Design a protein around this ligand. Structure first.
Ligand SMILES: Nc1ncnc2c1ncn2[C@@H]1O[C@H](COP(=O)(O)OP(=O)(O)O)[C@@H](O)[C@H]1O
Lengths: 174, 408
């Protein structure tokens, strides 16, 4: 899988492929790995269980309700329980989350990470996406969406665990 | 409590009592003094005691009424005890401490009912939210825009608006409740449900004590009936006993109530007598001292009678009109009609036994016994009680004395 997030000119996105793999074969080819949260204000993508998601995202929404849209805080509060609550402790995943404010990664370890330029590239294809995104972002006037898209393709092209089905979720603000 | 001047007190009292201006000023000075006290320093606050009054006058001329309105006017705990109620304790009978207890049990039945007023909106505001939450089960962790839970206030406001009379739709809510039920019930089951939370204990009951000690008003009726009379001796010590028994209460002491320790040092006492047989100076020394204020009330006159019929607020005549209205009937009293009602009342009181203004209630009531019954079958009519009507209904009765002792 490959989750790519990019932010340029009051535009932030999160794009992902749709391949789920079991051993050396493809189980499914159209997995939705990028959703939307907090009354379609907060976008997010992820790598993991379809339920872990539907549990980690629902909660995240509440943390946002308990911290007036302040992305970061809810995020900080999220990774908190996620590494503490006996039960929650078992869900494994990598949430990519971004709002007009900022974007970042949360990990079962409870970490909250803000990458160099709100550039996120998680998953087995993460680095190939990062490499292509970084390239584009530094040598062309392309858009945040055009980036993630193209970056994602490059990835699915290199990564044996990443395909070409996409699920993009933008966000305009300026 | 009230900041009313004596003059303003008397005014306010003129709305219920006709004449008896002196007793009015006496009782008014007393109330104002309680205000005057709180405006003093430490020492002088202990020293200054109520100026207890001894009202002197014939039956039913406004003694108790004056003391009841005075009490009511200052939202003060009021109790009325008949003095002879203790003349039998030499054989057995209520102890005098009961006065302070009752003046407490009613000083409670007061703070309680008046805690239902203040809490009659709370259960129907920050508590009607009970049903509205089972009508539209609030979001999983409301967000937080302090207008977000005010947002529905479209889906929400529609449920509260339709809840202006429309119910009987069974649901359920929450020892909280949980139990399934209706709304002509879940809603009312909510009335008290959320009200017992606002009202606490050690303040409500603790306050009754505070009231009694500070604004209590004891009215000892027929204090003259416990004075010494030259007919015997054994019954006198019995009487003089009630006087000694009453002594601690007006001199300053502590009484025990199932609500706490009450101190009488500042209870105001209004004693009452006719003093036809005894005289105030027949009271024991210690009691005369504690009864500094003496005021007489005059007997009532026919004119006083006419005025009592119509002048006071919610006068018997006014009440009557109101009650007949309940039946959709319009009652009206002409001046001469009332002049005659009073006239009759005076006649019976003079020809038989004088019971003061009381007589007006029985006369007025007999006069109307017919309309009172037929009221429902007269709906939408204008009945006028004039001199003619009055005479046709009362003459025979008043004229016949033996009959007057029974029927009027
Ligand atoms: N001066 C008055 N003004 C208005 N009502 C009066 C007056 N005197 C007597 N009454 C009426 O007569 C009844 C007699 O009781 P009360 O006034 O307590 O006097 P008392 O204590 O001398 O018997 C009361 O219900 C009251 O409504």
């Amino acid at each position: 899988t490959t989750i790519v997030s990019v932010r340029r000119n009051g535009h932030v996105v999160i794009a992902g492929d749709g391949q789920a793999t079991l051993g050396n074969t493809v189980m499914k080819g159209n997995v939705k790995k990028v959703r939307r949260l907090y009354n379609d204000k907060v976008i997010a993508g992820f790598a993991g269980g379809t339920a872990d998601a539907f549990t980690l995202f629902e909660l995240f929404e509440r943390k946002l309700e308990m911290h007036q849209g302040h992305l970061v805080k809810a995020a900080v509060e999220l990774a908190k329980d996620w590494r503490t609550d006996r039960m929650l402790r078992k869900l494994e995943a990598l949430l990519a989350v971004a709002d007009e404010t900022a974007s970042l990664i949360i990990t079962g370890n409870g970490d909250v990470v803000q990458p160099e330029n709100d550039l996120i590239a998680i998953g087995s294809g993460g680095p190939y996406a990062q490499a292509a995104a970084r390239a584009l972002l530094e040598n062309t006037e392309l858009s945040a969406r055009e980036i993630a898209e193209k970056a994602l393709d490059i990835a699915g092209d290199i990564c044996i665990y990443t395909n070409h089905f996409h699920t993009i979720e933008e966000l305009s603000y300026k | 409590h009230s900041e009313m001047t004596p003059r303003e007190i008397v005014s306010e009292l003129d709305k219920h009592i006709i004449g008896q201006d002196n007793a009015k000023r006496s009782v008014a000075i007393a109330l104002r003094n309680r205000w005057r006290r709180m405006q003093l320093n430490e020492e002088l606050r202990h020293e200054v005691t109520p100026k207890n009054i001894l009202m002197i006058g014939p039956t039913g001329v406004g003694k108790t009424e004056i003391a009841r309105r005075l009490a009511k006017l200052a939202n003060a705990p009021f109790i009325k005890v008949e003095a002879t109620k203790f003349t039998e304790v030499g054989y057995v009978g209520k102890e005098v401490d009961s006065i302070i207890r009752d003046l407490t049990d009613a000083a409670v039945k007061m703070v309680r009912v008046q805690a239902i007023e203040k809490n009659r909106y709370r259960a129907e505001e920050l508590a009607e939210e009970r049903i509205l939450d089972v009508l539209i089960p609030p979001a999983k962790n409301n967000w937080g825009q302090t207008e977000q839970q005010q947002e529905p206030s479209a889906a929400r406001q529609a449920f509260r608006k339709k809840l202006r009379e429309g119910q009987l739709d069974d649901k359920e809510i929450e020892k909280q409740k949980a139990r399934k039920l209706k709304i002509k019930d879940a809603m009312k089951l909510l009335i008290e449900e959320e009200a017992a939370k606002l009202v606490n204990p050690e303040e409500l009951k603790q306050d009754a004590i505070d009231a009694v000690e500070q604004h209590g008003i004891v009215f000892i009726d027929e204090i003259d009936k416990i004075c010494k009379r030259g007919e015997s001796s054994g019954p006198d010590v019995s009487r003089e006993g009630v006087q000694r028994d009453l002594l601690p209460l007006v001199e300053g002491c502590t009484v025990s109530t199932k609500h706490g320790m009450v101190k009488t040092d500042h209870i105001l006492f209004i004693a009452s007598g006719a003093f036809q047989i005894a005289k105030p100076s027949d009271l024991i020394p210690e009691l005369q001292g504690r009864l500094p204020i003496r005021v007489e009330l005059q007997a009532l006159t026919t004119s006083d009678f006419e005025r009592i019929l119509t002048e006071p607020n919610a006068s018997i005549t006014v009440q009557y009109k109101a009650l007949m209205a309940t039946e959709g009937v319009n009652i009206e009293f002409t001046d001469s009609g009332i002049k005659r009602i009073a006239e009759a009342a005076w006649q019976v009181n003079e020809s038989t036994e004088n019971i003061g203004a009381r007589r007006l209630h029985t006369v007025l009531e007999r006069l109307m016994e017919e309309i009172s019954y037929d009221a429902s079958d007269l709906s939408g009519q204008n009945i006028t009680i004039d001199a003619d009507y009055v005479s046709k209904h009362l003459d025979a009765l008043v004229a016949d004395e033996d009959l007057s002792r029974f029927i009027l």
